[PDB]
Amino acid sequence: KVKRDISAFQKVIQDISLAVNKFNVDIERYVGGDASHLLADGNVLIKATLDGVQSLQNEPPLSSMEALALVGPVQDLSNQILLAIQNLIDKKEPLVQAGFGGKVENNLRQQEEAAQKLSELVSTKVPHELADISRQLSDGIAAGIKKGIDAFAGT
Amino acid sequence: DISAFQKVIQDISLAVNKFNVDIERYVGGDASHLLADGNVLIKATLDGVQSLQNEPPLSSMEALALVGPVQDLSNQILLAIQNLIDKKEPLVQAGFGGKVENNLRQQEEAAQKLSELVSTKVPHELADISRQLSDGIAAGIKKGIDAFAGT
Amino acid sequence: KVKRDISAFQKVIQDISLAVNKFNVDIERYVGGDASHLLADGNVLIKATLDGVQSLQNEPPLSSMEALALVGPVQDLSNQILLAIQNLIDKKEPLVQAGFGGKVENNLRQQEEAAQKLSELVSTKVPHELADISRQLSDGIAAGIKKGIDAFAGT
Amino acid sequence: DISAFQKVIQDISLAVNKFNVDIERYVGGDASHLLADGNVLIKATLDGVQSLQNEPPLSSMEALALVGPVQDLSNQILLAIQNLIDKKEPLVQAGFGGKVENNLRQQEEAAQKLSELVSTKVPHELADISRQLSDGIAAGIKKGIDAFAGT
Ligand SMILES: CCCCC/C=C\C/C=C\C/C=C\C/C=C\CCCC(=O)O
Ligand SMILES: CCCCC/C=C\C/C=C\C/C=C\C/C=C\CCCC(=O)O
Ligand SMILES: CCCCC/C=C\C/C=C\C/C=C\C/C=C\CCCC(=O)O
Ligand SMILES: CCCCC/C=C\C/C=C\C/C=C\C/C=C\CCCC(=O)O
Ligand SMILES: CCCCC/C=C\C/C=C\C/C=C\C/C=C\CCCC(=O)O
Ligand SMILES: CCCCC/C=C\C/C=C\C/C=C\C/C=C\CCCC(=O)O
Ligand SMILES: CCCCC/C=C\C/C=C\C/C=C\C/C=C\CCCC(=O)O
Ligand SMILES: CCCCC/C=C\C/C=C\C/C=C\C/C=C\CCCC(=O)O
């Protein structure tokens, strides 16, 4: 316990990664029909994201060293989120034909709202020396979610 | 066809009643299962928002057919909130007071989204009673938030 | 605009200082009788304190340089709060005789609660290199408020 | 002697009514005076908690004497909350949405302290109605919080 125990931050990353990866597996396996289980995966992901905001609210700021140590796990999580979004977009045809396009749209709008809250929280923990890269990562994920929102809009 | 509304009500009822089963028999110790039950309930609530968002408003006949199930669900939610408050002592002793507070804040936000959406779907003849039931739930959640605050 | 604009933090300090100083002047001028105006001064101080929590919630962390620059204004504010508390305690006799001892006690308990919330907020903004001195300043103010609570307890 | 209760009611009524005067005639522009009005109202509310904390419970006859003034005050608070919501557009255009949201969160916390205290003072014969009025105010504050969230 000499150093910081930044395990709170690592746990949030892992919890979100677990939710993303379950969604991703299910979206890749999906080849048509009822998509309720995908919406439910999305809602476990929203819960993980909002759990993060609450878990980390009262944490002290990250040092440069502490934040640097999280750059790897955060870039990995970005990569995973962006891939999951692409795999979702890839399944637009079966999803829309099954009558789930709107519902997916609506889930994505809730993902966007939750991601924005978590990004905002993160910006209150990162030291200035990592503020630009952290914002870049957050913007990438926001742009990915918007791509998904745009793909399912009007369906 | 109003099966979308009946499915939401049933899914939330499943989750509320499972929570009531577990909280009534909880006397102390680890409460992770109770938080999980609350998570399922938030997910059901959000699934409801996503499901009903683009449904057109209910006719007086369609809404009337939902009155029984809705009123029962209201009563079950009010019971869940009171049961939770009743178990504050063991939950706080177990170190779960802050977790319960945080989960209730998420319940409050999800419920508010669903309530606002419901108010757009109900016909005027049932608007005042629907609002009364929604307000009771919202106020009850807040009373739970008050009970666990600072723990 | 090149540097941080830490004016949000300075405004909170000034707003609290304004409320403290009005209370202090009124407590020193008080020599008996109705003390409702003192309770009202205390409640302007509670508002300033809670306004601070809300104003600063979404700020990014302070750098070492930024936090260092606030050490002076924060020590001055501590000095002012501790003095006000002493001047309040000094007036215990007329306050108690006027029937205001409980009410002062209750006001102080609300000051304590609000100061705890603000201290907690401050701990989420200070970088580690100033975390011990910031905690020491916060503890000093808490100990002062407790001295006042103890003086008016049971009255 | 229940003058302490009458003074609290009058002080909160002064503040609520001043706010109603100002919000009803507000059509846009700087809203700093409206926030000041809200600040006075929070101070009055907290002054009430501090004042009544140690007063013993009300007899049925003492509480009955407060029913008129309390019910009027309830109605004025519900009006203030609706009036505020009605002026969301000019308040948000003026750049005051977040300030209003933050002030309402403080109103909510102050009101919850005072409501909890009141519930300890009211005799049983008026407990259910007192709680109903308190819940309506709490839920109304929350509806204002919802209206200004994210602005
Ligand atoms: C089936 C319905 C759709 C399922 C959802 C589809 C894909 C996953 C979507 C979005 C990713 C959501 C949340 C990512 C969470 C946190 C990163 C942002 C926080 C930050 O930047 O700090
Ligand atoms: C590269 C910055 C270094 C660490 C960032 C700090 C904290 C993040 C740790 C936990 C928060 C949980 C998930 C992060 C969500 C999305 C990626 C972060 C995007 C951002 O950066 O907003
Ligand atoms: C560990 C915490 C778990 C506590 C869970 C117990 C109760 C949760 C309380 C309320 C949420 C229940 C249902 C939400 C669904 C409908 C109400 C909103 C719709 C409306 O009103 O129109
Ligand atoms: C008793 C009058 C209300 C009947 C209106 C009929 C149907 C409402 C439609 C859907 C309800 C769906 C989810 C919310 C379920 C229960 C919470 C109380 C509902 C409310 O009331 O918000
Ligand atoms: C001494 C380190 C620098 C601290 C600066 C950070 C935040 C202070 C600025 C604004 C907050 C407003 C008032 C602070 C109140 C009491 C002194 C700070 C106590 C602490 O230290 O908790
Ligand atoms: C009738 C009673 C009048 C009040 C008595 C006098 C003073 C109240 C004392 C303290 C409350 C004032 C300020 C708290 C502000 C900053 C400290 C934040 C805690 C921290 O950052 O560490
Ligand atoms: C009709 C309710 C019976 C009146 C109870 C008698 C006295 C109330 C006690 C204290 C009054 C002081 C402050 C609160 C004032 C108004 C809000 C509604 C309160 C309520 O409704 O409690
Ligand atoms: C700019 C924001 C200003 C908004 C102000 C408008 C309305 C504020 C609403 C409610 C607070 C008013 C009074 C609190 C009094 C009584 C409730 C507690 C006692 C009880 O219930 O028993």
Side-chain angles (χ1 to χ4, degrees):
Chain A
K1 317 167 36 236
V2 156
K3 296 206 131 85
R4 191 149 184 183
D5 180 3
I6 59 165
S7 62
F9 288 84
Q10 301 169 313
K11 171 178 163 37
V12 169
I13 294 163
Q14 181 166 280
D15 288 343
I16 298 170
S17 180
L18 287 173
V20 173
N21 275 280
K22 169 69 156 144
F23 175 72
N24 183 253
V25 174
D26 285 345
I27 184 58
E28 290 188 63
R29 292 183 80 260
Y30 176 75
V31 293
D34 191 90
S36 304
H37 64 289
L38 299 170
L39 292 176
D41 291 344
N43 296 316
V44 169
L45 175 57
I46 292 158
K47 183 90 192 346
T49 305
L50 296 181
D51 287 340
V53 174
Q54 290 178 313
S55 284
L56 299 178
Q57 190 69 60
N58 288 332
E59 287 283 341
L62 297 163
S63 64
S64 286
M65 192 182 158
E66 288 154 9
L68 267 168
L70 294 169
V71 170
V74 168
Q75 178 80 258
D76 278 354
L77 180 58
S78 178
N79 289 343
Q80 302 161 45
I81 291 162
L82 296 175
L83 173 64
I85 296 166
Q86 187 60 52
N87 285 339
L88 176 68
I89 294 169
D90 284 354
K91 296 287 170 53
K92 179 175 170 171
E93 284 285 347
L95 286 167
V96 170
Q97 290 174 42
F100 280 81
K103 285 176 181 160
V104 167
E105 172 79 355
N106 294 333
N107 188 282
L108 289 169
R109 287 175 181 150
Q110 294 189 347
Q111 301 282 357
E112 188 181 45
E113 288 177 30
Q116 180 186 342
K117 292 180 166 188
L118 185 52
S119 295
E120 283 178 49
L121 168 298
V122 169
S123 76
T124 75
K125 309 302 179 187
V126 181
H128 189 265
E129 294 91 348
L130 292 165
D132 288 2
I133 190 61
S134 184
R135 182 179 319 110
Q136 273 208 310
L137 283 161
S138 295
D139 285 355
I141 287 159
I145 299 168
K146 166 180 193 316
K147 188 176 189 329
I149 289 171
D150 291 348
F152 290 86
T155 85
Chain B
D1 179 7
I2 62 166
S3 60
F5 288 84
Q6 300 169 309
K7 174 178 164 2
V8 172
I9 292 162
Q10 185 161 303
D11 286 347
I12 295 170
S13 184
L14 228 51
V16 176
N17 281 337
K18 171 68 156 144
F19 174 75
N20 279 320
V21 172
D22 286 341
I23 191 65
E24 288 173 14
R25 69 193 299 264
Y26 176 73
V27 296
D30 193 80
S32 304
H33 66 292
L34 300 167
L35 288 175
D37 291 339
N39 296 340
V40 171
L41 179 56
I42 294 159
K43 292 178 288 205
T45 304
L46 295 177
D47 285 344
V49 173
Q50 291 159 24
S51 288
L52 303 178
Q53 189 69 61
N54 293 323
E55 288 287 337
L58 298 161
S59 66
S60 217
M61 193 179 330
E62 287 158 3
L64 203 35
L66 297 171
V67 169
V70 166
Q71 185 202 25
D72 280 354
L73 179 57
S74 173
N75 289 337
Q76 295 317 297
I77 292 163
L78 299 172
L79 175 62
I81 294 165
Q82 191 60 50
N83 280 336
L84 178 70
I85 293 168
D86 285 351
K87 293 290 165 57
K88 176 178 173 169
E89 293 157 306
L91 286 168
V92 170
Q93 158 74 42
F96 280 85
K99 291 175 180 160
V100 167
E101 174 79 358
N102 287 352
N103 190 277
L104 288 167
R105 285 282 185 194
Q106 292 204 57
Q107 300 278 357
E108 188 185 41
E109 177 191 330
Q112 186 274 339
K113 290 180 168 96
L114 184 52
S115 294
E116 183 179 57
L117 184 53
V118 168
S119 74
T120 74
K121 309 303 177 188
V122 297
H124 191 273
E125 295 91 344
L126 289 166
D128 289 356
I129 191 60
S130 182
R131 180 184 314 110
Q132 182 169 45
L133 290 184
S134 301
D135 286 356
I137 289 158
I141 295 169
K142 184 53 166 45
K143 285 174 186 169
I145 288 169
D146 294 337
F148 291 86
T151 72
Chain C
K1 221 173 131 321
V2 156
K3 297 207 323 286
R4 190 149 183 182
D5 179 4
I6 59 165
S7 63
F9 289 84
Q10 300 169 313
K11 171 178 164 37
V12 170
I13 293 162
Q14 182 165 280
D15 287 344
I16 298 169
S17 180
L18 286 173
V20 173
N21 273 278
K22 168 69 156 144
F23 174 73
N24 183 252
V25 172
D26 285 347
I27 182 58
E28 290 188 63
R29 291 183 79 259
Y30 175 76
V31 292
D34 193 82
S36 305
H37 65 290
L38 299 169
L39 290 289
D41 291 344
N43 295 316
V44 169
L45 174 56
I46 293 158
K47 183 89 191 346
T49 304
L50 295 181
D51 286 340
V53 174
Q54 291 179 136
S55 284
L56 300 177
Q57 189 69 58
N58 285 342
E59 289 284 341
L62 297 163
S63 65
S64 286
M65 191 180 150
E66 289 155 8
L68 268 169
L70 295 168
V71 172
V74 166
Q75 179 80 259
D76 277 355
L77 180 57
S78 178
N79 291 341
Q80 302 161 44
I81 291 162
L82 297 174
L83 173 64
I85 295 166
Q86 188 59 52
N87 285 338
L88 176 67
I89 294 169
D90 283 354
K91 295 288 170 53
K92 179 175 171 171
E93 284 284 347
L95 287 167
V96 172
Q97 291 175 42
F100 281 83
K103 286 176 180 160
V104 167
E105 171 79 355
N106 293 334
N107 190 281
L108 289 169
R109 288 175 185 301
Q110 294 189 345
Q111 302 283 355
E112 189 181 46
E113 288 179 29
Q116 291 169 347
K117 291 180 166 189
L118 185 52
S119 294
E120 172 182 49
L121 167 299
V122 169
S123 75
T124 76
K125 308 302 177 188
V126 182
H128 189 270
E129 292 90 348
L130 291 165
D132 289 1
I133 191 61
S134 184
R135 186 167 12 267
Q136 180 183 110
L137 283 160
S138 172
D139 287 352
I141 288 159
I145 299 168
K146 167 180 193 316
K147 188 177 187 170
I149 290 170
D150 290 350
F152 289 87
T155 85
Chain D
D1 179 6
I2 62 166
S3 60
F5 288 85
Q6 300 169 311
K7 173 177 163 37
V8 172
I9 294 162
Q10 184 161 304
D11 286 347
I12 296 171
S13 185
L14 227 52
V16 176
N17 280 339
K18 170 68 156 144
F19 174 77
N20 280 320
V21 171
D22 287 341
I23 191 67
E24 288 174 11
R25 69 194 299 264
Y26 176 74
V27 297
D30 192 80
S32 303
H33 66 292
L34 299 167
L35 286 178
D37 293 338
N39 296 339
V40 170
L41 179 56
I42 293 160
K43 189 184 108 32
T45 304
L46 296 177
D47 287 343
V49 172
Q50 290 161 22
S51 286
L52 302 178
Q53 189 69 61
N54 294 323
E55 212 128 314
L58 297 161
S59 66
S60 218
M61 37 192 84
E62 288 159 2
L64 203 36
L66 296 171
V67 169
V70 166
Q71 186 200 24
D72 281 352
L73 179 58
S74 172
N75 288 340
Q76 297 319 126
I77 292 163
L78 299 172
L79 175 63
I81 293 164
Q82 191 60 50
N83 280 332
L84 178 71
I85 294 169
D86 284 354
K87 292 291 166 56
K88 177 177 172 169
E89 193 67 19
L91 286 167
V92 171
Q93 158 74 41
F96 279 84
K99 292 175 180 160
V100 167
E101 173 79 358
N102 285 354
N103 190 279
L104 289 167
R105 290 175 180 151
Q106 293 204 55
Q107 300 279 355
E108 186 183 48
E109 177 193 333
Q112 185 273 340
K113 291 180 166 96
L114 184 53
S115 294
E116 276 318 297
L117 185 53
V118 168
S119 76
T120 74
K121 310 303 177 187
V122 177
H124 192 272
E125 293 92 344
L126 288 166
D128 288 358
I129 190 61
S130 184
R131 185 53 71 165
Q132 182 170 39
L133 291 183
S134 302
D135 286 355
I137 289 158
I141 297 169
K142 183 54 165 45
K143 286 174 186 169
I145 289 169
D146 292 339
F148 292 88
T151 69

